[PDB]
Design a protein around this ligand. Structure first.
Ligand SMILES: Cc1cccc(CC(=O)N2CCC[C@H](C(N)=O)C2)c1
Ligand SMILES: [Zn+2]
Length: 139
């Protein structure tokens, strides 16, 4: 679990969005596993606007942060799950690092701010949904 709170927006994994997220929907994209909902309170986070390929992510299944080298956002095949049919997920960045299903929502940060959230993983990989291209989150 986890979310990014920026301005009057909440960014979550689309597959973990709540009834309240859907009732306050701003934007969603199944191909990216992202959903953004509106909030009444001002957020605590800021978004990176950069091309970093290193950063640190929070891993809830270890209660720890780990450093990672990750690929640029790309279109990657993701096998069928209870949440989606087999498909290509876009804007996904892969890295070597521990992750388990409940780690989705963990934030990846670089020195410039929030880069993205854990969305996929397994077998010593961790995949992050990028948010750096969503310029409207800032205004
Ligand atoms: C973080 C992690 C580690 C091991 C396993 C998993 C599960 C996983 O990859 N799924 C299920 C949920 C939706 C995901 C998606 N973005 O399509 C795919 C997730
Ligand atoms: Zn950066």
């Amino acid at each position: 679990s986890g979310a990014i709170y920026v301005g009057n927006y909440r960014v979550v994994n689309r597959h973990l969005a709540t009834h309240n997220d859907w009732a306050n929907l701003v934007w969603e994209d199944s191909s990216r596993d992202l959903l953004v909902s509106s909030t009444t309170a001002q957020g605590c986070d800021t978004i990176a606007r950069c091309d970093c390929q290193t950063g640190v992510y929070y891993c809830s299944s270890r209660r720890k942060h780990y450093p990672v080298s990750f690929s640029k956002p790309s279109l990657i095949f993701v096998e069928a799950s209870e949440y989606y049919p087999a498909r290509y997920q876009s804007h996904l960045m892969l890295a070597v690092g521990h992750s388990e299903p409940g780690d989705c929502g963990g934030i990846l940060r670089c020195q410039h701010g929030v880069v993205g959230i854990v969305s996929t993983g397994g077998n010593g990989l961790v995949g992050f949904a990028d948010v750096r291209d969503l310029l409207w989150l800032d205004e």
